[PDB]
Amino acid sequence: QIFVKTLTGKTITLEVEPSDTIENVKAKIQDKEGIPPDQQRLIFAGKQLEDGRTLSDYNIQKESTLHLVLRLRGG
Amino acid sequence: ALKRIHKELNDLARDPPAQCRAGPVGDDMFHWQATIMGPNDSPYQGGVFFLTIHFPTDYPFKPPKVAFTTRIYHPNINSNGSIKLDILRSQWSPALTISKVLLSICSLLCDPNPDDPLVPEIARIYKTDREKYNRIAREWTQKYAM
Amino acid sequence: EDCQNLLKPCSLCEKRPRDGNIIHGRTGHLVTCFHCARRLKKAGASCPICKKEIQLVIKVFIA
Amino acid sequence: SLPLNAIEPCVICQGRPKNGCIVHGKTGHLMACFTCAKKLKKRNKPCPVCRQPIQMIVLTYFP
Ligand SMILES: [Zn+2]
Ligand SMILES: [Zn+2]
Ligand SMILES: [Zn+2]
Ligand SMILES: [Zn+2]
């Protein structure tokens, strides 16, 4: 189980595999919040989370909270 | 806008995002100061970065104007502290709140965009030798960001 | 303050939240889950509240 | 966290219940009041939450 703070500031609870991939998580979030994974950006420790990677890769322990904001581009 | 801005401050007062803080400077509810702590395991670690935030009258239909007061070394942010980031102009959404804007900005610190740079001169360093770009970013943090 | 009815479970199956919006013209009634609203439409039933024809059923996400 | 969300006022103006439903395809986001949501449509802005084009604003009741 992990927690996500949604764009509007609500907290949702997710059941996740330690080896789960960010791309999947976004998919889960799409099921709950109805947001396209292409419009999601997950932030942890102030750093973004790359789709290809996995919760394991990013060291996400149980109960750790992730922050959702909208996709963005620097320019 | 005030009712919206007040709500944003109240949630910031109580439960602020991991590293960020914001709130009005003095009297004017439409002028805020914010602080962003440099992300851990980045060249900005330990740096304390101050920003100014001016909410427009039609907020949040229009974006707040956000700029760095603290000097920072980064290809998408210039020496006026101007931030060229899409959610501050075209990609703005009225559902974004300062907390989330501030979080997006931290994530920009660790994931720049050298391909379409606000500061070309820093873009080349990021692209070519990254140990250098990181070296300078670290010096600027100690010089300017402490 | 009738906004609190959105806390109650679907008024029919009662196993799911009310995320089905039953749309008629430019208005809509959100008293049932998506699956129930979709099943009402499919059966040719009208809106259970206002008995207007059901033009569209959408899954609503609160935010 | 549904209790806090469904009963909170419009995220945009914070003055009115969220009865404007922003419709796109088979889904909608219920976030804003009807007035604030119409302004978005009228100015041809996309949905604040998912960024999808807004197909229409439905004034939504929950009895
Ligand atoms: Zn049902
Ligand atoms: Zn009806
Ligand atoms: Zn409103
Ligand atoms: Zn939407």
Side-chain angles (χ1 to χ4, degrees), chain A residues 2-4 6-14 16-18 20-22 25-27 29-37 39-46 48-49 51-52 54 58-60 64-72 74-75, chain B residues 1-2 4-13 16-18 20 22-40 42-88 90-110 112-114 116-120 122-130 132-146, chain C residues 4-25 27-63, chain D residues 2-25 27-37 39-44 46-63:
Chain A
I2 67 175
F3 308 91
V4 186
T6 295
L7 194 68
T8 90
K10 55 199 269 216
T11 322
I12 63 188
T13 300
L14 268 54
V16 182
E17 260 62 31
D20 248 311
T21 176
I22 298 303
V25 178
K26 291 186 168 183
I29 289 165
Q30 177 181 34
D31 296 2
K32 284 197 177 198
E33 304 287 303
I35 310 160
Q39 297 290 339
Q40 308 173 36
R41 183 175 179 101
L42 289 168
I43 308 310
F44 190 56
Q48 101 163 341
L49 300 178
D51 286 318
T54 88
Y58 289 111
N59 179 346
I60 268 78
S64 79
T65 164
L66 269 44
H67 296 262
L68 182 61
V69 304
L70 291 163
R71 175 192 65 88
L72 60 82
Chain B
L2 168 76
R4 166 57 182 248
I5 300 165
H6 169 74
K7 178 73 188 296
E8 285 197 51
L9 182 56
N10 199 340
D11 283 327
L12 269 165
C20 295
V25 313
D27 53 302
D28 184 342
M29 204 68 181
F30 288 67
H31 188 270
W32 286 21
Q33 169 167 87
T35 82
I36 277 173
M37 312 303 141
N40 292 326
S42 68
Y44 316 100
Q45 180 174 21
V48 162
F49 303 87
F50 293 85
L51 304 91
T52 73
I53 299 162
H54 182 224
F55 299 92
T57 52
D58 50 338
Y59 185 73
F61 284 103
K62 240 42 182 181
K65 300 86 162 191
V66 191
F68 275 86
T69 284
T70 301
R71 272 226 157 182
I72 182 159
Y73 188 70
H74 189 292
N76 302 116
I77 310 169
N78 72 7
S79 56
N80 297 342
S82 275
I83 311 169
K84 179 159 73 54
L85 176 57
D86 61 352
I87 56 162
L88 296 173
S90 278
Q91 294 318 106
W92 167 249
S93 154
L96 288 157
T97 61
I98 291 306
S99 303
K100 296 278 181 175
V101 169
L102 288 187
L103 272 189
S104 307
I105 294 167
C106 290
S107 65
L108 181 64
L109 294 190
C110 303
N113 178 14
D116 173 26
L118 180 41
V119 189
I122 297 172
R124 291 191 300 270
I125 304 199
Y126 188 86
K127 272 152 145 273
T128 68
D129 61 348
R130 192 76 59 86
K132 196 199 182 184
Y133 165 98
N134 285 313
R135 179 182 76 65
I136 303 171
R138 207 177 307 125
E139 291 171 352
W140 285 38
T141 293
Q142 305 175 41
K143 181 147 139 112
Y144 308 130
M146 307 250 313
Chain C
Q4 52 181 326
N5 302 327
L6 288 172
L7 316 190
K8 298 176 194 177
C10 171
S11 73
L12 306 170
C13 74
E14 261 149 358
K15 80 211 324 195
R16 292 177 288 263
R18 328 187 150 187
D19 47 14
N21 200 358
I22 291 174
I23 289 179
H24 25 66
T27 60
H29 265 112
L30 176 56
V31 291
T32 64
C33 71
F34 188 57
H35 290 302
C36 290
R38 203 143 62 89
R39 286 162 189 180
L40 289 174
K41 182 200 172 55
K42 186 166 179 44
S46 75
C47 178
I49 295 300
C50 72
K51 296 322 241 163
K52 296 181 180 178
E53 176 192 73
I54 296 187
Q55 301 194 264
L56 170 57
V57 173
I58 66 164
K59 188 168 173 62
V60 160
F61 299 91
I62 304 220
Chain D
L2 173 63
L4 287 185
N5 236 221
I7 314 199
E8 179 218 331
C10 178
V11 305
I12 302 192
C13 80
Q14 299 274 339
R16 293 175 280 227
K18 312 182 178 173
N19 59 4
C21 184
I22 287 161
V23 184
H24 31 61
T27 68
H29 280 104
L30 187 51
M31 85 181 75
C33 71
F34 188 60
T35 321
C36 293
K39 300 184 166 116
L40 298 176
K41 214 303 196 55
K42 179 187 191 176
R43 292 145 173 186
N44 293 272
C47 173
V49 165
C50 57
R51 258 170 194 158
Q52 294 172 266
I54 299 176
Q55 297 185 4
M56 93 182 85
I57 309 312
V58 176
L59 169 62
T60 296
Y61 298 97
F62 351 90

